[PDB]
């Protein structure tokens, strides 16, 4: 998606 983390 956009960037790993959220999620």
């Amino acid at each position, epitope marked *: 998606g956009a960037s*790993t983390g959220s999620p």
Partner: antibody
Amino acid sequence: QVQLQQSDAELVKPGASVKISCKASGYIFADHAIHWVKRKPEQGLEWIGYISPGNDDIKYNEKFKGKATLTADKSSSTAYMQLNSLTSEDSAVYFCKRSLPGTFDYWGQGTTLTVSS
Amino acid sequence: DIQMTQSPASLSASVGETVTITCRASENIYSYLAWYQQKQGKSPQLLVYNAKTLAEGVPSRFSGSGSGTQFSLKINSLQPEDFGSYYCQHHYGTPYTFGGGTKLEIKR
């Protein structure tokens, strides 16, 4: 070739501050967040925060908000964690680790912080 | 701010048995659950990410399962080298909380 270099040991007086270094090599520093994890005997593992150097995104566990301060020197590809107002409770092994659980998961050796006169 | 509950706290089992370690989340975390092995003096070793996906180099007798709030790590054909502490950690969002850990002893 991936490495996260941490000193084995830090010794610091109660009430003082310490800046634990995590020196990354073998990959582009800006590609991955660096997470900090506390391992204290009989307190299992505890996530402290991450600094994502690529995008200046810093996130803290609320418990460590005033306690911990994360920074990165992009030029020497080193993540720093500073603990403030140290007590015997802060004595522990502090790991730096790359990325989230996944293909990029990688751990430093851990820095044994002893808070003592 | 999701509570992660691990069980059992501690566990004894023989070589060749299957151990089942449980991790239960207070909220839905979808697939975003990891398992780590720790032995004393050593960095945590990632066993499983995204509930079911084995990390490079982990023996195939390790398998993670689950989704939502209900997760499990199974070690099939337990080996003497499997002794140590096992921690779940979610990677859903900050804070990335750990369960309390399971200490696994090999009976002999």
